[PDB]
Design a protein around this ligand. Sequence first.
Ligand code: NAG
Lengths: 502, 500
Amino acid sequence: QGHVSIILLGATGDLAKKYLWQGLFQLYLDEAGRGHSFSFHGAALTAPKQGQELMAKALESLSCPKAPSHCAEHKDQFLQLSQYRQLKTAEDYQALNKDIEAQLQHAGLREAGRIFYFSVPPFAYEDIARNINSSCRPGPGAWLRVVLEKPFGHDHFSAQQLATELGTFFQEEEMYRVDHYLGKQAVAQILPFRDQNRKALDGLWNRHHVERVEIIMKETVDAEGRTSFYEEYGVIRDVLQNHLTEVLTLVAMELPHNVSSAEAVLRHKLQVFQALRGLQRGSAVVGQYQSYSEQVRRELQKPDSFHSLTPTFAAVLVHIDNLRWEGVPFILMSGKALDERVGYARILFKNQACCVQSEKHWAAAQSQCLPRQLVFHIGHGDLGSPAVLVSRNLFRPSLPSSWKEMEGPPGLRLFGSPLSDYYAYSPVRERDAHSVLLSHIFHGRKNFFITTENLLASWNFWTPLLESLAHKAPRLYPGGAENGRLLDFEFSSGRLFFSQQQ
Amino acid sequence: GHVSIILLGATGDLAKKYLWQGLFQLYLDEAGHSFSFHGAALTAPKQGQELMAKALESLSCPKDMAPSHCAEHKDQFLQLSQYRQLKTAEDYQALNKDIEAQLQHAGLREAGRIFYFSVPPFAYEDIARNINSSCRPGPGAWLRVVLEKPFGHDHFSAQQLATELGTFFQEEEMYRVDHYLGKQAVAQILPFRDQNRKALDGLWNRHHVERVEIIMKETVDAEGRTSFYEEYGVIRDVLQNHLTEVLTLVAMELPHNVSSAEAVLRHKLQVFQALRGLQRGSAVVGQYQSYSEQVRRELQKPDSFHSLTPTFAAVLVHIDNLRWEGVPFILMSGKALDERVGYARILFKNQACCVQSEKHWAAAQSQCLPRQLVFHIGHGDLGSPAVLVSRNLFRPSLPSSWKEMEGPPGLRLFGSPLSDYYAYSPVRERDAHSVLLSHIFHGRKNFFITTENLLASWNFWTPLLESLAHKAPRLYPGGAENGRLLDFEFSSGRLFFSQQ
Ligand SMILES: *[C@@H]1O[C@H](CO)[C@@H](O)[C@H](O)[C@H]1NC(C)=O
């Protein structure tokens, strides 16, 4: 019960038009008619009338989920509630304050909060936040949940500097650092999956029961339309640091007695960040596709001849010095312009049985000589949808009513094994990442977000690898299906090396 | 070089089941060096004479060579074969005189004498000294004595029998044979490790081997053999003597050369002294449902008797070296099971991650496919001896006696198409007993059980025999019905049944 105001401070960019406006809408569509009033203040540096026209075009670009009365009433209310305003000068911020209290007077209720989504380019951060602190603070006990974007820095030093410079203005409890990959429906089912299936998996998470762990994100689309974001950032900081490390610290984490608790999850994942081996020179292998250097050459004009050392595919080996993962290797690899686009967290058990019966009667749900594995399929690939795949000989898993037993094509091969072998589950309704992330911002659930202790622990993990890998020339690959086995690699002891030397 | 071979078990069925055929094959391989062949039994001499004539009637031959030469070679072997009845020491003196008479008939020279024992063990003593007192050969000749596969039931009986027979004959002049040491791929593990010196020296580690399996599965239950089987058991008849020997063959550190034929004998004991002890949790034990009724029927036993004799046994072996400290070695054998297979499988752990798709994985280049090195020896889906090397590992190098195998497609060995393997096969199918008799005539001693290694292998299973002296076996229905009843797992250093 209370009016909640959501303001999108960023300039209307590409992803601002693509994902976020549909996200806020969907956010309005879930919680409408529950005593919560709303105000969707479009904010940018553009003209007010032109901003109103562009933002109304954005409101007309939205699509309701698959009744015409539902679409008509909710699109009319969404056109009524949302309003653009100019954000060029400092006194326009208290003009926004006047607008917010005016819309509170129209709502006739008590203020509940003020969400300030940031999407601005990183040329300036202190002026907008200091104007928010000057005027745009809320009233009687309303919270102020601001959200920052993905680029946080290039080392631990810049990340710490920006964390203190932005935590001067706002509390760290108020802030919501968004992770895209934590909103994916299979990543968000890892800890609940371990929660209602701890009776038959906690006896198997050990070092003496797990062969290997692979956290995989393959992509076919290269750096098209996104080159200038990529030459400074690199694939280690792009996906491994902010997506793969968080699912890595989600699988290898001691579960608390209440996963629904907030702070226990972050303290246990900090425990995982403290109980892991450091990274060396030889624990990582990198590559870049041949079109990347000439793409950077043709996108930015620099004198003489230039060759970029930016990694585009990377594989790292991670060991966790514990009583749980002492000998288990953890492979995190990702790259673009590969031969496939897929994403999965796959834990592979070790072979420990000899079967008296031959392969003529090796049933999928009975014998223990067929491989045992758990796959969290995030999406794409041959399956497309997100999935939870259990080997049938392990156990019968329990998943909530949001997921159901799916029936894919029989005989489809995943890691050399037929699909029929897996107990496969898929969600009963697909949801975007940003929609559930904005719903969690509105609900104030900080379990799916990043605190600065976790961010600096991640940067202290990853920075020695980055400064060691800052002078190695990567191995070129043609990309697509023409790669063959040029990027394949082995792990020997705590070191990674390519299969086919050159 | 006239050699006098005497078979002392002519009344037995195994004499003309394998031994007469092996002696005929030895003549066919070695026909000029003179030969003489004599037989002996505790049988009436006319009945013994018609019996060895009947044994000489049933003689097979290779099909490649012409039957016209086969007929005259068979007539020559019929000429050289003789029989003699033995009761008292004067009869063995007459045997020595008849041996000298055969020297004066053809080839007046004693190259040596060979004695083959096939009698039941309780008469092994006195006949032996009947050889020792009078039937010794000449000055420059040698004497060879061959004994059968039983060597007692523990280290106590093996030590007693070895010390009883060590008085008459020396270690240098005594030969011991087991049944499955004559297999050609069993005789090919050390030549394979010898030839692949540059390729396989960096892979015989703890760093690359996941597990080692040695299986000898059977589908035939002992029907009339169960009187012999009841006091012996599956551990003593195959696991103690054949599977242990192959294990030592694959686990021993290879010498400077195998042709020296002496460092092979001493490098085998280093596997024995480094083998850790066997506990009662290292073995699983089963029997089929009809074995109790089988011992109840032929042997005079009460109707409430339930034997505890094992027919199926799986044991776990750990060695403790700088090579294979944590690698498990699973030895399995059984009766009335599904597939009559015999092989020795080496499995390597999964080491690679492959970027390219599973639909584009070459059998000869992608390391994500399983790597294996299999010595198949008997009666599988192949039906022939084979040395299977997966193509992603390395290109194997076998000698001229082994050819590359043309395998039919649609064949699944260890979950993989035969194509995946670089399989090989011998040119000539030679039996085990024939090449063992050829080695007995040759005197190479690397293919025979010595006195030290026999006792070294008996005290390793005697605590397991005493530990499982009262454990009830698992009663499986037998045949193909035992799907998952006999499946087992190894947890650390323990074995347990999957089903309760
Ligand atoms: C808001 O930010 C300004 C920036 O200088 C700071 O002075 C002020 O203390 C902040 N207000 C808080 C933390 O309540």
